[model samples]
Target chain A: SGFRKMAFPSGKVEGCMVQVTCGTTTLNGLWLDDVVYCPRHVIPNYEDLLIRKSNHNFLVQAGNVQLRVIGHSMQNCVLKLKVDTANPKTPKYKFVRIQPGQTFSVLACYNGSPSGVYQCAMRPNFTIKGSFLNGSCGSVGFNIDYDCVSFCYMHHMELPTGVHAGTDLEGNFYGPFVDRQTAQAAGTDTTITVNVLAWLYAAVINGDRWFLNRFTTTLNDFNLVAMKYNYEPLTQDHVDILGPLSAQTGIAVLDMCASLKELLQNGMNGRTILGSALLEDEFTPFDVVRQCSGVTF
Target chain B: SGFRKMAFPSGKVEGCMVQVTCGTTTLNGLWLDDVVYCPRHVICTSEDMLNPNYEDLLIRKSNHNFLVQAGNVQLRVIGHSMQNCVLKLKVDTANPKTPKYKFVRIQPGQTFSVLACYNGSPSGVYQCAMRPNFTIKGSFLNGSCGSVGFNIDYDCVSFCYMHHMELPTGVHAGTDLEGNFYGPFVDRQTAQAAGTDTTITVNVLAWLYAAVINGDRWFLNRFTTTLNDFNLVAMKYNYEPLTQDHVDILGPLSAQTGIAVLDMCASLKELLQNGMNGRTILGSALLEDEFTPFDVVRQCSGVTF
Candidate 1:
């Protein structure tokens, strides 16, 4: 069964073993092997968090550095701190109560496996019963999902958000580590798009239209913006639908992924694409599009 | 011919040989004696020199061992004549215009140097005559202490309340408490000389300094600014010696002189106020020594203060 329904925990591994590297590719010694080894793998001993929000918040404070969980919870919320986010046996976490006004300060656990994703739910030690991990939303949006949390610098924005991670298991191709979307669900965040394109093109280069199709469907800034972490990944339907576009650009996309990843990885073999990630400063997005358009396989 | 035109040296008719039964005739109790007679009136003495500016001062000093003070007024007088004579210094007592057709007699000159501006008003120069023996118009010479005049100090009169001192009687009006004579050249030539006003003016101012130095605090205080000045300024005897320090010899000096010197520092001030007031000035150095009150006093007493 070369296909695992989703990525999960396993013995850890360092080094990306990335075949076609991209700029700043996952920082050399990364914990990416779980996902690689998986039919769909991930980071281990490393925990990162992300959210789609209306009233939830995550923050770091000054007391020897504290990480707090602040979402208005009506039902009793027993906060739990889990380390490395990968245990199953007492997959249970050390529970701390989220008093009346969101008081359980969630201390971040940095056990040195570098960084990745973790989850949260209002439940006691290891209990999945009342937790939102199952993605149930009748009232709390963990109630309802917020699109266009339309603003930032607001009260709920008090916390620096945690990491966003998405993966495709059935199709066996994982995606990027992105964060919450603050503004419009427009297809415009260039750096993010370029990287997404980089991966899409990676599929074309590998001639694995399967991933290109699977990824491109959930790829636009739209779904990525709202369904940050819990967003459903590729299924048979995504590939069947995205297949036509993947087929058309399959070749150029392959060349483009090569050029872009190479541009990202070793800097264009000297023709550096240094600031494709930076905004509105040196080069225009058209410059990237123009230069990227001329790319060949 | 009800009234005489000039004050004359007289003996025309003796005392009021009339009965008091006339309208307004005095019962002889009041001080209306000599003029009451309308007749012979006089005392005689040779007067002396002092300061000026276009001036002629008729005052007199003498050769007696006496230095005396009657009250608080800083006092001094002097004279020069053909012979020894009598001079009486009277007060109009307080009326401003009445010619002293009236007179009070003090014995012959050289001895009658007791002078004052009295506790009451209505006063004037010491007018004396040559013994009413002749009806000489010019014989009516008086010893006056004019506003601009300085009462020379042959001696210090000290304070009035502790009122025990007297002015030096025979000292020249321009002499200091120390027996020094600042000149109209100190001779008959300077006094009768036509231009003696110049010499006298010079001496009077010099003598003014002497008067202040030896003058009674009450004396300087009397003539000082009526308003209170700095203690140092107001402290001048300006009106009369009221300061406790009056018990001593002196106080500090001042340019402002107490309003001695003025304002309390009257004891510490200058001869006059700093300057004029409002649009005009209290005084003007404009005419300097001329046309000023200094000249007026110089015209009268031939001295400066």
Candidate 2:
């Protein structure tokens, strides 16, 4: 087979492999191998609940973190923490219930060490809890798909001072981080990290608002008047349809995928092209990735 | 002689004088009788300059302060304060020249006491200096129409706050004893000493940027969004029609006195209904008057409340 897509666990190698390299002056290190993200390719984990009986049912466990699932069915499933003896300094946090088509991440650090892996979702050990009024219902199955990766800590690269961060009204920090240790230093406990460089590729090239807004708000004056319009990549169809005036509002729309392809291939050289041609404030694609990850470095 | 038009000086009887009754708790006093201001009637003070010969020319003099006019023609006349020995603490202030028509005030206090009188413009005694390169010039007589004159000799019987409130940057405003307005000066002071008033009330336009004065809506020209760049220019009142003479030399004065007339009309309306602390307001820099009303705005041009 040319590419064994099914052989690999869903998100294991869904994204492009990027070899992060900053010039000679900075530090050197290896990032988590699963750096880029492909949301559609998540590993699905399913569990069936037992008949009417109340037991401390374990749904998922990774390293020192464990959780129990309680609720009616797939439409509404609540995650309750059964054990978290990992990091004694940090208090046990509450979990949000999963609604239909909703995805949430679980920050799992094994043995309270930074070396532990983090999973977006984990398969669970089902134990029945209180069948209300002998709730004689058919078999209830709970399904979840999770993407896991090791903590990324780059000792080789020094975070550029240009990276800035700000917190919202809820006191959650937002900015770019070079590593897991940096995110922890900025008071981040419960968190969801994203591969933002890929997001920018999707946003500027495909005009995706979900990825755009999530990333742009981290920069200063991100709400400029120009940003209100579409950022669709320019194509030959546009030139043919709009006659040579395909350029809209003087905003440079490039083939973002092409730039990203070059970026992941040759690394820093492609970053220079995208920064000058397709980004705001001339920031490199890696800079955008930093902010989208909710860390301050 | 039902109402003598030229009988009194311009600001003598311009404003209305209400028997200010501020209830029982506060101290009572008699404010300046000619409390109101009507811009139309100002007394004319004209002085003729002599033939070429540099001399110390004196224009006007009140109790302790006196000034002299020294220059070529009316357009070139410059005012130099002669003496301010009365208020030694306050330094001598310079005066702006009158092109065709201009009215400037001289703060005069007699014998260094606050009881002295103040007049907008006074007649001058010209003393010519060295002829400019033997430059032969025709007759040049300077004329000024100074409207407001304060001869508060009798008002001193009761006492008013006589404050010179320094407004924040980009605000020029003041009041007659009556609750009226005179805006358009960014860096200016409004000083009034009289009776009847114990409080120096300064009214401000809270919601700046746009205001409706005398039912006329105005906006802070957004083109020059910076207040320092293009501030709200004062507009002349419709009642004070501009003649050819006014249109020429009075271009600057029109903006100076114009917005005051408009702001006075609207500010008084708001103050009358709301009371002293009714309209947008500020601090007391100096002493107070029993009921002196000073009006101003927080921002430049905008619709009024």
Candidate 3:
């Protein structure tokens, strides 16, 4: 609004550009400079296109150019496009980009911003061009929030922090809690340190009824042999608490909603920043998540 | 014409008198002393008389004094009265007499002829009577020609006689004679006498079978022990000549008609000679045979009735 007679670049508009806003404030403006030029679009040739005589593998004409999709860094990013000459209500091309090496095709009639020379770029110089006679890149970069630090170690094991209470000097046990001093003094006696190894071992073993039965039977057989002379029956509390601990320690917990929300938001941001970068890589944030280590998590 | 008037006895007529005749010949005349009297000529009184109210037993109101039966002599001269009247046929009263008996009841409206009566005599007397007690007797010697014999033996034994040729040597020897007696005298031998006794015995046995077996088994048992045995074992011959001998030996052979005629005549003669010394005994000529014993002959003589 302040400068007059601004010099504009002498280049044709390329692939796609997206502008996003938050609460009536413009966050950023992204540019897709890769442009694919088809002779049918430039020369107004409707005979082959309109008459339905074009083959599935038809090449571009002499003056036509090819476009490329930019790769994305965020996972779960969806890439969509449409083309139409007469109507813009229905999209003719739609796709998602979530992984490296993903691609998309360009049509002569695209219902995007405008038609001219175009390129796909990231924040700075991450960009490519689209032209006739030469096909453009069709890959893009997508980023997934599942790779964030909050959920990185979610499946790790935890241990109990409480202590058992003791009675008199005659070596008889009382209830679980005593006085505050005794509770504090018993802390460092035998620190129970739990590792993911125990959870994994339990999951691997107790997940199958056969493995569970084999483990329990082996324990029972060893106990029968080892405690043959000094065997004592277990109390009711010991048997009753066994199932709850086993189930609670075996199941893995993670924040699935926060992970998905982060993934969607980051995917949309990457898509905005990449802009015409989809001309090289065609992948969505979901595809990126599926291909990354988040799948195993 | 001879007129002979006989005096009436003292107790003769007490009722109507009746006369009897044979065509133009009058035989006798008598009177009923009582309405009923004994047929043997026994006099009857009121005390000895039967009541006439019992007409089934009493024949007449007076008595049967002059009763006669022509067929039977037992009723003649028996001096017995009939408790009941009957057909008034003859009865034999000769002893061993047929005891006094009654015939079937005779009503007052019926008529009968009393053939004879007997009073323990050898003969019997008889007369004819009409309904309601009308009776008359014939003269003792002036009756019609009657039977000469009462015995049945004479009739049974009587046979016919004829003549027959006698064979030489008393045997025919089953050879034909053609005046060839003296040839070579081959196989010459004396002819056996004709077994006439065996012939007679066989004939007699045959006659016994016919009379006893065929006629009556009762008589057969009474006469012999083996009735069927005799009929089987006895050999019978055709008595061509001996039949003539039987006829000639028992001459004056009588037929059944002649015997029946003699029965009627004998009945009549017995009635006329009842209670008289000149009475003739009626012997059954049908039962008389030379070969039969007197007891058998006597036993066979009677009405089969």
Candidate 4:
């Protein structure tokens, strides 16, 4: 008498689905010798087909004994096997020596199969534990699920000012300064000046006096200079100095003037205008004027 | 008796500026013949102060008498001789000798200087212009000035999706095909019995469309196949005659699944579901079901794959 049937168990582990199945068959007087199963589709020719070989010489002795194996295919697959040797490299063993009541185990490799397939083969052999077939298969399969979503925000960076091509004299645009003589000529009479006005505004609307004092100390540089610089009528000299200085500081004198003009035109309260004193007072007047003016006004 | 003052009646042009000043003096007929104005406040070395050749050659020429000619700072500048003579190579010529004027006109190569000084010239030639003595100086200067205003929206071409690292895919939430299998297997029954009720909600937003399409396609194909078919998922079998069509079409099952998934995921209904903060149905349950499949989806209907 040989093992009547084989069984496999299945249960959910993580957040995933699990399924298990088995296949078994009866045989004649030949005792059960050995059995092996592949936990994959076992596709042939395309590589990874299940290749099983028995180790015991007497396990597969009976020629009349019937054997059956259970497998699954989601799409397409094939199975291949060779008996006698335990490894693909060894010689084929004699199948006539297999006994009727003995059990044997063999190594097998499967290819082109799904991840979760568990194989179960039955031959004329003694009963063997089936729970040891969890990770025996060479291939495994599973799908990763994902979705698509999006978000957006307004384009918020301040537009950068480009290079200054003309002279730096205040009120003088880019067109007039072609040579040192022209630059010097415009440096005197041009009233349309480039003045970088500095402005200081309370960070928060009506904060405490302590906050003001701290703000003043922290931003005193920005505000005092803003209040002291002349916003209107930047002279030719101012344009000449500020234009080049802006280049050095990576700021455009024209942009600074335009921005200050916009701030003034908008009529935003809590902002104090710093007169042209900023130019004469600051160590690096043009840079200080640009920084303070940009932040405040 | 000599050249008087240089004039630009056209006022000033845009993008460029001009300046004129006196030059150094050279004796001729008991008066300053080839006199050039020395730029004020410029410190000349003892050697340069002693050697009047540079001054005479640079400023004394009767042709290009102006000090500066500025335009888009990076334009090419060429210095040519309007009148040809020994002074063409003389480097310095007296006024009596046909008043050789050295004028520098910007050629195409010199345009980069303008870019370098865009912010402002801290220590370089801050201005540039052609000589008034040249015939076409006014028109050239005016033409350059007229083109100075910046064109704000010229380079706003949309970017390629593949180049973007992170793109917003929009919102998508759909049922996971619990245990769908294309082939026969004992586990396939159990998987099918599990049903398609399981829902997977993910934030798969990509700023670029290509990323969204690729990611969505992959997820859907894997879900439907219930297999990790990333590599070597074959299409042909020996049971049937081997044909190129059978093999080629079958080999890309995973890719096909991915494409289908992308099509389904990039739907307005899917997007709306993903975007909805709270539970609110926009259409009938039957309509929603119809929108789930890729075939029913309309092209460019608020869904971009």
DockQ of each: 0.00, 0.00, 0.00, 0.01
User: In the order shown, what is each candidate's alpha-carbon RMSD?
Assistant: 53.2, 34.6, 82.6, 37.8
True contacts kept of 4: 0.00
Q: What residue runs in model 4 are displaced by over 4 Å at the alpha carbon? A: A1-297, B1-89, B92-111, B115-122, B125-305
What is the Cα-based TM-score of model 2?
0.15
TM-score of chain A of 4: 0.18
Model 2 ranges with Cα > 4 A deviation: A1-115, A118-251, A255-297, B1-305
Interface RMSD of each: 66.7, 43.6, 99.9, 43.9
Writing each residue's lDDT as its tens digit, candidate 3 over A1-297 gives 000000111111112222222122221111222222121211123344334422212222111322222221111111111111122111122222211122111111122221111111111111111111111112111121222211000000011221112221111112232222232322222100111112222223323111122113233443343233232222233233333434544422121112212322342232321111111122222222222211311
Give the lDDT of residue B260 in candidate 2.
35
Query: What does candidate 1's lDDT look like per residue over B179-203, in tens digits?
Result: 1222222322133211212111222
lDDT of 2: 0.20
lDDT string, candidate 3, B195-229, tens digits: 33222322222222223211232222112223233
Q: Residue by residue across A1-297, what tens digits does model 4's lDDT show?
A: 000011111101011111112222111111112222122221233333223322221122122232332222221121122233232211122222221111111111112111111112111121111211122222111111111101000000111111112111111222232212122221211111232221121111112111122111112333333344432244445556554445544435454554444443453243332211112111123323322222100
lDDT of 2 by residue, A142-211 (tens): 1112222222111111122211121111212223322122432222111111122333442343233221
TM-score of each: 0.13, 0.15, 0.11, 0.14
What tens digits encode model 1's per-residue C-alpha lDDT throughout A155-229? 000011111122121121112222233431212112233224433432343233432122221234333432342
Superposition error at B226 for model 3 (Å): 14
